C-alpha cells in the first residue's frame, strides 16, 4: 500500500551505515546497557521530530511534492528557509558518510583478497570517486527503475537481519578462533560493564551513533504527493520509528550477548583450568583472549568494526546486505538534498544562491544542484575516518531537527496562519523540550562546531529578518499574510490614547497615481515609514460597468505604484461628482487607527481654462475637509521635471505645518538641506520674537538655521503686481457699479461664483497681504527646494471660489515647489 | 553635566576588586596576560557604553528612567528583559561589594589582637550587620548622596595617590615581603604567566569582569541634567578610558614592586655571594626556600591586601578600600530596586504586580528593598569572594550582551522608533560585542551560562505572544502602529488575482452594545477568516457632530475590547441610514482588506416602525446587490441532536455552504452535525445525492446527511395563507375592493402601498416563501443554526413592505435563522 510505500522508504532511509558497519564499536565501547540507553535517547529525539512533522503534515490544506514545500506552506518562510538550507546541507553531506562506509566495507573485502593496495588510506577516496560518479548517474537516470527496485533492495536488508539473528543464537565451531559464543549469560555480565571506553566517552559515542536513527523527514516529506499524503503519512512515520527502534535494541542486545569484546585469531589460549583470576571474561572457554591487555586483540568486538559480518553465518551474503543498505541510503540522500536546495533557490529568500535554479533536465531534475552536492560530498569524502565524519553529520542533522521542533512550537504559540494540528498527540511543550534537549546534546558534542552552527543559525535569522521573502506567501498562501495583517490591525485597534501621536496620514486626491508622479514622490517623502498615505481616485463613469473598471484600474495602478516603490493603497470609489467621492474617502476610508486625517491636493494650475463650477467644487472640497477636522495640504509643483528648505510659519494653525519639514529632513534625500525659518513679527520685537520662536523651534528639534523675523508684511507690493492680480481676476470681475443693477442681479443669480464688488473692498487688505508674501517669497526663498507656508483660508461663502483660487494663484505664482499647509487646532506633540 | 555622570561612573566602576583582587590577578596571569584581560574587559565595557549612548540618543530627549528609555527605544520585550537581568545583577553585586568589605574587615581583625570565629563565619556575621546598616542608610539616603559622592571620590583618589607614592618608596623592613622600589628584574619575572590552584586565563577574566562593570548605572541611577542627551555619553565613555588607564596604571605597577612568593620572616636572607638564584628574589638579598614547595605567608599569592602593605601609612589605603566598597554598595543597591519597581509598574510581567506599591516620605518600593536585601543576605552565605565573583560576572555579561543585541535588533530591523543619531556607532560592532559576550559566558561556568540562556529563552517565549496578545504594556503606540502599516502593504503588494475570496463582513448595527447575540454569532465565523466592521451611522447636527462622534467611537471601542471580538468599530456621519451604509460600502477598508458582505440583523418589530425606515432598509439590500456584495441577514432571538441545517436552494457561489463550514471550524460548534437540505422535484434521488455530495466534498463540509425535499412549490395550508394576508393587511392596498379614485390618490399619496396586482403577480412566490416556512418548521424544529438561501427580487418592482413581509414570513417563529446570498465568485476559492 501507499502507507506501506512510505514505511518501506523510511526503513530504507533509517537503515544505513550503522546497521552493521559501526554498531559493533558502539556496543563494545560503552556496553549493552549504555548502548541501549543511547538507542532510547536517539529514539526520543527522533520521535519528538516525528511528532513535529506530524503536526505540520496534518494541516488542513495539502499541496506540493517537496519537503521544503510543505514546511514553507505550513509555516512562514522565516523558519522555512533556514530549515530548508540546514537540512539540504545535512542531507547532501550524509551521502559522504554512506558512500565512505560503502568504500570501507569494500576495503574490508579487498584486504583478504588483494594483499595490499597502493594507498589504503586513499583507497577509500579512490573508491568513493567511482561510487559518486556512478551514483550521480543513478540519481539522474532510471527514477522509475529505482522506485520499482525499492522493495527488491530492502528485501536484501531484511534477509541480512534474518541471517544475523539466525547466526547469533546458535553456537558454532567455524568462528572458533574469533569471538563467537552463543547467548552466554557470563558474556552479558562481563559486557554490561560501562567501563569499556577507549579514548571516547558516552556523549562521543552518542554523537557517532546518532546518524543511524535519523532521516525520518526525508522518508516522510520528499515524496510529498501520494495517496492520502496529508494525514496518513505521519502515522506511518511514527510506526517507522517504533519498528527501527525495536530492531536496533534487539540487535544490540543480541550482539552484546554473542561476541566477546577482544578476540585474537589464534588456535591457542584454550586452558583446561584457568579459574585462577579468569583473565577472559568468558572464563569457561577462553578460546581467543590472551595478552590483549598489552597487544590488543585484532578481531575483538571493539577492535574489529566489521566483526558481525564475519561471525554471522553465511558471511558472503551479509557484505552484499551492507552494500545495498549504504548505496540505497546514499542514493536517497543524493536525490533528496538537491531538490530541497532547488526549491529553496526558487524561493527568493536567498538571491545570492538564485543562480542554482537551472532545471536542465526536461522533466525538472535539476543538474546544478547535483553538481554542487557532488562537490561538497567528495570534499567530505576527503576524510577517511568515519568516526570523524559522524560528528559533523550528527551536528547538522541535530541542528535541522532542533530548528524544526522550535519552528513547530513557534507556530503553536504564535498562531498567525491557519495552523491547526490534526494530530492530538502533538503538544507544544513536548516539542519545546525536544528542541531544548537537541540543542543541549548539540552543545555537549564537538562544542566548537556547535557554536559555529549557532552562529550560522543566527546569521540566517539576521538575513531573513532584513530581506523578507516574496514567493510562497505571494502565491497560493496569501492567506497567511492576510491573517498577519488582520491580526496586526486588530492589535492596533487596542491602543486607546491618540493625544501623544498626531501621526499624519495623507489622503492624496490625485486624478490618477501615474498622473503627477512628482506630487506622489514629494508626499511619499515626508510620509513613509512614519505614516500611511492613501491615493484616492474618484472614478467617473456609468453605473452598469463601474465595478469591472474599478477592479482593472485598481490592479493596474497598484502594480504601477508598487513598481515605483510607494507606501500607498489605491482606494477607488464611485460617485456622481468629485465632492461625493471626496466625502466617501474622508469619512469612511481607513480602518481603526489607520484613518486619514490630512487631505493632500495638487494645485489646479489649469483653473483659468476650466469651468469654474469645478473650481467651485474644488473649494467646496477644501471647506468639507475643514469641517471634518482634517489638515489641508496643497502642493503646487512644476511638473516639467539643493541648498535649503525654507519655512514661512505665519499663523498658529497647528503643529503640522512645522512638522512637515522635519520629516523631510530625515529621509536622506533632503538630509543635505537647512531649514531657514521665516516668521512675521513687529519691527520693535524681532529679538523677543527670535527667542520666543526659537523656543518652539528647539521644541520641534528641527535644528533651525535661523529665524529671519521680518516686518515687510502689510505693505503695498508695487504697481505692477496689483496690475497682474487685476489681470488675473479680470475675466471674472463683476462690474455691478458700472453695469445696471438689474443685469448685475441677473448675472449673480444665474451664476454665483463671480467676484462681487463689495468682496474686493472687504478683502482688499488680504489681497495686498497675499501679493506681499508672494513678492517676499520671490525675493528671499527663490533659491530653495521645498518652501512651506501657512495656507490662507476664509469663512465658508464669505469669499467667492474664483477669488479664493485667485489668492492661491498669487501666493504660489513663480516659486519653486511650494507646500501650503493648514493643520487642525490640536498640537502634533 | 560632567560632575553628574563622570563622578558616578568613577565611584561605581572602582569597586572592591581593584583594591584586593587585581594584585592576585596579576599573580595568576602575567603582566601581558593581565593587560590583555584589561583591554578585553574594556572592549566589552566600551561597546556596552556605545550601545547605551545610542539608546539615549534614540527616540526622544528625555525619559522617565533607563527602563523607560529602553522601552521607548525598542519596546516591551527587550526593555523588560534587560531591566530584570540588570536588577538581578545589581542585587547580587551588592552582595559582592559587601563581601569585599567583610573580607577587608576580617583581615584587619586578623591583624588586630582578638578573633571572634573562624574566617568564613566572621564574614557572614559582619556582612549581615553591614547589610542591615546599609538598609538603615540606603532607604533614605538620596539627600546626602550628591554631597557624599564627591567626598568619597576624593578619599578614593587620595588612596590611589598614596599607592602611587608608596610604589616608588622602598623600605628595608618590608623588603622580605613583595615590597621593592620599582625593580626591573622582578617586573621581568612577573611578566610571565603563573597559573596556580587550577586557575586559568578565562577563569581569571571571569573573576575580574565585575571590576570593570557599572557604567550602565551612569544613565540608570539618574538623569536630571542640563543636557541629558549629551552628558550621558561624554561622561561614561570617558570614565571607562581613565578606568582602563588606572587599571593598567596599577597592573604593571603592581608587577614592579611585589614578588610572587614571599615570607615575613627576616631570618631567611641570603649572603651576597655567587648563588644559583633561579628565583629573582635572591638577586637583591633574599633567598627564600622555593616557596612553591610550602605555602608562603605573603607575596601577592597569599596576602590579598598587598596593595595595602606597599603604600606608606596604610590607614589611608584601607580607608579608600572602605570608601570604594560602600560607594559601589549604595550605587548598586539604589539602582536595582528602582528598576524592579519600574518593571512592576510597566505591567509587562503580571506575576509580580504585587511589588509595585511603595510608600514613605517619598513613595519608594520598600517591598522591592526587603526582597532584594533578603536574597542578597542569602548570597552572603558563600563567604568566599572568589567563589562569589563568577556568578555576578555571568549576570553582568548577560545584561551587557542583551543590551548590545537589543541595539543590533533595533538597528537592523529598521525599527520605526529607532534612530541612532550618534556620530560614531556601528550596529555591526554592537553585534560583534554581543556575540563575543555570548561565547565568553559559554566559556566560564558553562552550566551557569546555560541556565541564563534558558531563562532568557523562556522570558522571550513568554513575552512573544502571551503578553502582547492581551496587553503588551508599552505606553508608546508607535512601535506597534507603524509595524501594522507595512504589513498592510504586504497584504496589498501581493497579487491575489481572484483566488483569495474570504468572508469579510461589516455588521451594519448602530449600537454594538445592543443586540450582542448577532455580533457574537457573526464573529463566531469571522474570528480568524476575515474582518468584522461594526459600522455605525450617526445622524445629527454638524456643529457638535465630531466631538460626540469620537466619544461614541472611544466608548464602543472600549466595549468591543472588553469582550472578545476581533472587530473594528468604524463609524460615519450621514444624513440617513442609506447614505452612511453607502459611505461604508464604498470607502471602508484599505488595500485588499475591504468588506465583501453586509450582515444585517433583521428589523424585528417593524410593525410599529415608520415606513420610510423599512424603505431604506430594503434599499440597503438592493444597493448591496448593485455594488456586488453578499447580503446575509439573521433573525437571532433577542432573549440571548445538535445540528446545523443548511438549505442550499439557490446557487449563490457557495457562501450559503461556506458560512456553516466556518461555524464548524471553531471551538463552540465542534459538535455541529450539519444536515443539508436540498430542493428538488420528483426524480432520481441519486442525481441530487451525488451532486450535493461532491459539491460538499469540494468545500470539505463533511455532511452528516444530505436529504432532498419534493414538497417545495405546493399550495400551503389555508390557515397560514390567511394569517399572512392578515399580516400584510395594514399595508395592503385593496385597490380592487375600494373605488379606483381612492386607490389612485392613495398610491400617489404613498408609493409603498402594495396593490392587489402585486399579490396576484407573486401569489406563487408568496406561496413558496410560506410553504418553505412550513417545511422548515416541521422538518427542522430543533436546530442550532438554520442557514438558508436568501430570496431576491427586482429593484423597485415589489414594494419594500411586501419584500420585508416575505423575509418575515420565511422566518416567522424560528430558532437562529441566517439567510444568505452572495456574488457568484467564490467557486472553490477558499
Ligand atoms: N487638483 S485637481 O482639481 O486638478 C483634480 C483633478 C482630478 C482629475 O480629474 O484628474 C481629480 N480626480 C477626479 C477624477 C475624475 C476622473 C478621474 O479622476 C481630483 C482633483 Cl483634486
Ligand atoms: N440591522 S437594522 O436594520 O435593524 C439597523 C439597526 C440600527 C440600530 O441600532 O438602531 C441601525 N443604527 C442606525 C443608528 C441610528 C442612530 C444611531 O445609529 C442601523 C441598522 Cl441598518
Swiss-Prot record, chain B:
<feature type="binding site">
    <location>
        <position position="400"/>
    </location>
    <ligand>
        <name>chloride 2</name>
    </ligand>
</feature>
<dbReference type="GO" id="GO:0044298">
    <property type="term" value="C:cell body membrane"/>
</dbReference>
<dbReference type="GO" id="GO:0044297">
    <property type="term" value="C:cell body"/>
</dbReference>
<dbReference type="GO" id="GO:0035865">
    <property type="term" value="P:cellular response to potassium ion"/>
</dbReference>
<dbReference type="GO" id="GO:0035633">
    <property type="term" value="P:maintenance of blood-brain barrier"/>
</dbReference>
<feature type="topological domain" description="Cytoplasmic">
    <location>
        <begin position="460"/>
        <end position="830"/>
    </location>
</feature>
<dbReference type="GO" id="GO:0098719">
    <property type="term" value="P:sodium ion import across plasma membrane"/>
</dbReference>
<feature type="transmembrane region" description="Helical; Name=7">
    <location>
        <begin position="234"/>
        <end position="255"/>
    </location>
</feature>
<feature type="binding site">
    <location>
        <position position="15"/>
    </location>
    <ligand>
        <name>chloride 1</name>
    </ligand>
</feature>
<dbReference type="GO" id="GO:0150003">
    <property type="term" value="P:regulation of spontaneous synaptic transmission"/>
</dbReference>
<keyword id="KW-0325">Glycoprotein</keyword>
<dbReference type="GO" id="GO:0055064">
    <property type="term" value="P:chloride ion homeostasis"/>
</dbReference>
<feature type="binding site">
    <location>
        <position position="210"/>
    </location>
    <ligand>
        <name>chloride 1</name>
    </ligand>
</feature>
<dbReference type="GO" id="GO:1990573">
    <property type="term" value="P:potassium ion import across plasma membrane"/>
</dbReference>
<feature type="binding site">
    <location>
        <position position="11"/>
    </location>
    <ligand>
        <name>Na(+)</name>
    </ligand>
</feature>
<protein>
    <recommendedName>
        <fullName>Solute carrier family 12 member 2</fullName>
    </recommendedName>
</protein>
<dbReference type="GO" id="GO:0098658">
    <property type="term" value="P:inorganic anion import across plasma membrane"/>
</dbReference>
<feature type="topological domain" description="Cytoplasmic">
    <location>
        <begin position="51"/>
        <end position="81"/>
    </location>
</feature>
<keyword id="KW-1133">Transmembrane helix</keyword>
<feature type="binding site">
    <location>
        <position position="210"/>
    </location>
    <ligand>
        <name>K(+)</name>
    </ligand>
</feature>
<keyword id="KW-0630">Potassium</keyword>
<feature type="transmembrane region" description="Helical; Name=2">
    <location>
        <begin position="31"/>
        <end position="50"/>
    </location>
</feature>
<keyword id="KW-0915">Sodium</keyword>
<dbReference type="GO" id="GO:0071944">
    <property type="term" value="C:cell periphery"/>
</dbReference>
<keyword id="KW-0991">Intellectual disability</keyword>
<feature type="glycosylation site" description="N-linked (GlcNAc...) asparagine">
    <location>
        <position position="276"/>
    </location>
</feature>
<keyword id="KW-1010">Non-syndromic deafness</keyword>
<keyword id="KW-0868">Chloride</keyword>
<feature type="transmembrane region" description="Helical; Name=3">
    <location>
        <begin position="82"/>
        <end position="109"/>
    </location>
</feature>
<dbReference type="GO" id="GO:0030007">
    <property type="term" value="P:intracellular potassium ion homeostasis"/>
</dbReference>
<dbReference type="GO" id="GO:0006883">
    <property type="term" value="P:intracellular sodium ion homeostasis"/>
</dbReference>
<dbReference type="GO" id="GO:1990869">
    <property type="term" value="P:cellular response to chemokine"/>
</dbReference>
<dbReference type="GO" id="GO:0072488">
    <property type="term" value="P:ammonium transmembrane transport"/>
</dbReference>
<feature type="topological domain" description="Extracellular">
    <location>
        <begin position="169"/>
        <end position="200"/>
    </location>
</feature>
<keyword id="KW-0769">Symport</keyword>
<dbReference type="GO" id="GO:0035725">
    <property type="term" value="P:sodium ion transmembrane transport"/>
</dbReference>
<feature type="binding site">
    <location>
        <position position="13"/>
    </location>
    <ligand>
        <name>K(+)</name>
    </ligand>
</feature>
<feature type="region of interest" description="Scissor helix">
    <location>
        <begin position="475"/>
        <end position="492"/>
    </location>
</feature>
<keyword id="KW-0812">Transmembrane</keyword>
<feature type="binding site">
    <location>
        <position position="328"/>
    </location>
    <ligand>
        <name>Na(+)</name>
    </ligand>
</feature>
<feature type="binding site">
    <location>
        <position position="86"/>
    </location>
    <ligand>
        <name>chloride 2</name>
    </ligand>
</feature>
<dbReference type="GO" id="GO:0019901">
    <property type="term" value="F:protein kinase binding"/>
</dbReference>
Amino acid at each position: 500500500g501507499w502507507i506501506k510505500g512510505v514505511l518501506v522508504r523510511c526503513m530504507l532511509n533509517i537503515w544505513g551505515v550503522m546497521l552493521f558497519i559501526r554498531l559493533s564499536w558502539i556496543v563494545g565501547q560503552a556496553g549493552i546497557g549504555l548502548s541501549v540507553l543511547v538507542i532510547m535517547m536517539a529514539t526520543v529525539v527522533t520521535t519528538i521530530t516525528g511528532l513535529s512533522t506530524s503536526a505540520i503534515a496534518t494541516n488542513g490544506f495539502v499541496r506540493g511534492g517537496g519537503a521544503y514545500y510543505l514546511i514553507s506552506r505550513s509555516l512562514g518562510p522565516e523558519f522555512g528557509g533556514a530549515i530548508g538550507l540546514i537540512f539540504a546541507f545535512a542531507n547532501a553531506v550524509a551521502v559522504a558518510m554512506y558512500v565512505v562506509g560503502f568504500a570501507e566495507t569494500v576495503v574490508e573485502l579487498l584486504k583478504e583478497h588483494s594483499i595490499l593496495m597502493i594507498d589504503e588510506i586513499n583507497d577509500i577516496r579512490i573508491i568513493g570517486a567511482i561510487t559518486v560518479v556512478i551514483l550521480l548517474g543513478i540519481s539522474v537516470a532510471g527514477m522509475e527503475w529505482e522506485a520499482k527496485a525499492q522493495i527488491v533492495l530492502l528485501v536484501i536488508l531484511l534477509l541480512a537481519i534474518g541471517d544475523f539473528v539466525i547466526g547469533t543464537f546458535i553456537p558454532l565451531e567455524s568462528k572458533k578462533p574469533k569471538g563467537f559464543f552463543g547467548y552466554k549469560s557470563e558474556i552479558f555480565n562481563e559486557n554490561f560493564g560501562p567501563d569499556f571506553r577507549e579514548e571516547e566517552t558516552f556523549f562521543s559515542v552518542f554523537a557517532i551513533f546518532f546518524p543511524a536513527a535519523t532521516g525520518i523527514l526525508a522518508g516522510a516529506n520528499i515524496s510529498g504527493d501520494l495517496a492520502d499524503p496529508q494525514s496518513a503519512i505521519p502515522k506511518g512515520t511514527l510506526l517507522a520509528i517504533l519498528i527501527t527502534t525495536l530492531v536496533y535494541v534487539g540487535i544490540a542486545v543480541s550482539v552484546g550477548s554473542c561476541v566477546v569484546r577482544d578476540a585474537t585469531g589464534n588456535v591457542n589460549d584454550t586452558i583446561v583450568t584457568e579459574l585462577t583470576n579468569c583473565t577472559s571474561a568468558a572464563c569457561k572457554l577462553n578460546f581467543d583472549f590472551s595478552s590483549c591487555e598489552s597487544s590488543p586483540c585484532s578481531y575483538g568486538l571493539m577492535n574489529n568494526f566489521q566483526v558481525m559480518s564475519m561471525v554471522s553465518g553465511f558471511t558472503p551474503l551479509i557484505s552484499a546486505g551492507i552494500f545495498s543498505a549504504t548505496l540505497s541510503s546514499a542514493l536517497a540522500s543524493l536525490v533528496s538534498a538537491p531538490k530541497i536546495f532547488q526549491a529553496l533557490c526558487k524561493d527568493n529568500i536567498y538571491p545570492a544562491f538564485q543562480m542554482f535554479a537551472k532545471g536542465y533536465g526536461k522533466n525538472n531534475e535539476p543538474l546544478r544542484g547535483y553538481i554542487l552536492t557532488f562537490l561538497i560530498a567528495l570534499g567530505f569524502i576527503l576524510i577517511a575516518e568515519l568516526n570523524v565524519i559522524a560528528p559533523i553529520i550528527s551536528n547538522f542533522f541535530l541542528a535541522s531537527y532542533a530548528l524544526i521542533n522550535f519552528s513547530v512550537f513557534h507556530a503553536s504559540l504564535a498562531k498567525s496562519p491557519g495552523w491547526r494540528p490534526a494530530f492530538k498527540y502533538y503538544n507544544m511543550w513536548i516539542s519545546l523540550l525536544g528542541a531544548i534537549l537537541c540543542c543541549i546534546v548539540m552543545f555537549v558534542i564537538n562544542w566548537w562546531a556547535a557554536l559555529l552552527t549557532y552562529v550560522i543559525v543566527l546569521g540566517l535569522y539576521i538575513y531573513v529578518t532584513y530581506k523578507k521573502p516574496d514567493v510562497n506567501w505571494g502565491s497560493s498562501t496569501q492567506a497567511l499574510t492576510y491573517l498577519n495583517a488582520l491580526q496586526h490591525s486588530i492589535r492596533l485597534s487596542g491602543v486607546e490614547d491618540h493625544v501623544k501621536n498626531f501621526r499624519p496620514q495623507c489622503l492624496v486626491m490625485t486624478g490618477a497615481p501615474n498622473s503627477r508622479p512628482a506630487l506622489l514622490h514629494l508626499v511619499h517623502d515626508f510620509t513613509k515609514n512614519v505614516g500611511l498615505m492613501i491615493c484616492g481616485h474618484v472614478h467617473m463613469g456609468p453605473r452598469r460597468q463601474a465595478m469591472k473598471e474599478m477592479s482593472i484600474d485598481q490592479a493596474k495602478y497598484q502594480r504601477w505604484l508598487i513598481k515605483n516603490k510607494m507606501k500607498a493603497f489605491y482606494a477607488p470609489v464611485h460617485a456622481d461628482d468629485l465632492r461625493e467621492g471626496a466625502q466617501y474617502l474622508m469619512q469612511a476610508a481607513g480602518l481603526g487607527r489607520m484613518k486619514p486625517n490630512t487631505l493632500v491636493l495638487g494645485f489646479k494650475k489649469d483653473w483659468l481654462q476650466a469651468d469654474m463650477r469645478d473650481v467651485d467644487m474644488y473649494i467646496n472640497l477644501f471647506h468639507d475637509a475643514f469641517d471634518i477636522q482634517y489638515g489641508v495640504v496643497v502642493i503646487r509643483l512644476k511638473e516639467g521635471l539643493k541648498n535649503t528648505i525654507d519655512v514661512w510659519w505665519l499663523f498658529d494653525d497647528g503643529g503640522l505645518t512645522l512638522l512637515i519639514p522635519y520629516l523631510l529632513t530625515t529621509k536622506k534625500k533632503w538630509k543635505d538641506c537647512k531649514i531657514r525659518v521665516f516668521i512675521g513679527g513687529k519691527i520693535n520685537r524681532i529679538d523677543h520674537d527670535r527667542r520666543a520662536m526659537a523656543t518652539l523651534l528647539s521644541k520641534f528639534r528641527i535644528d533651525f538655521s535661523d529665524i529671519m523675523v521680518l516686518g515687510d508684511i502689510n505693505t503695498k507690493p508695487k504697481k505692477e503686481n496689483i496690475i497682474a492680480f487685476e489681470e488675473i481676476i479680470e475675466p471674472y470681475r463683476l462690474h455691478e457699479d458700472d453695469k445696471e443693477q438689474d443685469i448685475a442681479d441677473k448675472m449673480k443669480e444665474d451664476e454665483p461664483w463671480r467676484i462681487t464688488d463689495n468682496e474686493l473692498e472687504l478683502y482688499k487688505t488680504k489681497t495686498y497681504r497675499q501679493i506681499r508674501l508672494n513678492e517676499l517669497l520671490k525675493e528671499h526663498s527663490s533659491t530653495a527646494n521645498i518652501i512651506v507656508m501657512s495656507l490662507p483660508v476664509a469663512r465658508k461663502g464669505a469669499v467667492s471660489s474664483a477669488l479664493y483660487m485667485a489668492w492661491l494663484e498669487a501666493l504660489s505664482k513663480d516659486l519653486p515647489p511650494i507646500l501650503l499647509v493648514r493643520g487642525n487646532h490640536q498640537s502634533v506633540l
